[PDB]
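Predicting holo structure, 4V7 bound.
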Amino acid sequence: SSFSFGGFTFKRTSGSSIKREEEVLTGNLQTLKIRVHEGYEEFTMVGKRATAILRKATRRLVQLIVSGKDEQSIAEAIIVAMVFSQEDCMIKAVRGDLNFVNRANQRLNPMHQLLRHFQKDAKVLFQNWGIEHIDNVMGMVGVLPDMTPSTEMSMRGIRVSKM
Ligand SMILES: O=C(N[C@@H]1CCC[C@H](Nc2nc(-c3c(CO)[nH]c4ncc(F)cc34)ncc2F)C1)N1CCCC1
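Done. Tokens:
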């Protein structure tokens, strides 16, 4: 079962999941109804300018190792991964003036709306995601919320691999 999302081709390599419709609150306290995937799964993300290994559990990104053409290409893949993960901090990063998902049309997709929102500006997403101290894994680097490489700190779960 291969599928497309945010310009990437996803392929499940391990795990299984069941769907459950859930109501989540944004940072604006707005209710969104999302189709939540329950279960630990592993995927490959293949795009035109980036590729990744994604390890996720229910509404939680465990790890993402990204490889792409440059900073912008890698950032695009990170954004899709965070939205795909269905995490609460990704959902809570939706806040402020006019930052509302059009829900008067039930047939619309909140996942695509969240994607479009973070594609325009990932600064609140990347800042609100969290940062962790990383080990000295050679070949893989950490990446800070401004997409600066760091050998000591990175965005929680995120590693950059060389091409
Ligand atoms: O729910 C909607 N869009 C979704 C956007 C994300 C990908 C999703 N499609 C698909 N998602 C998945 C999927 C799996 C399968 O292992 N795990 C997931 N975990 C999180 C997630 F957001 C989607 C998944 N497996 C196969 C798919 F074709 C469709 N829509 C589109 C219009 C009607 C509602």
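The helical segments are 71-84, 88-92, 110-120, 123-128.
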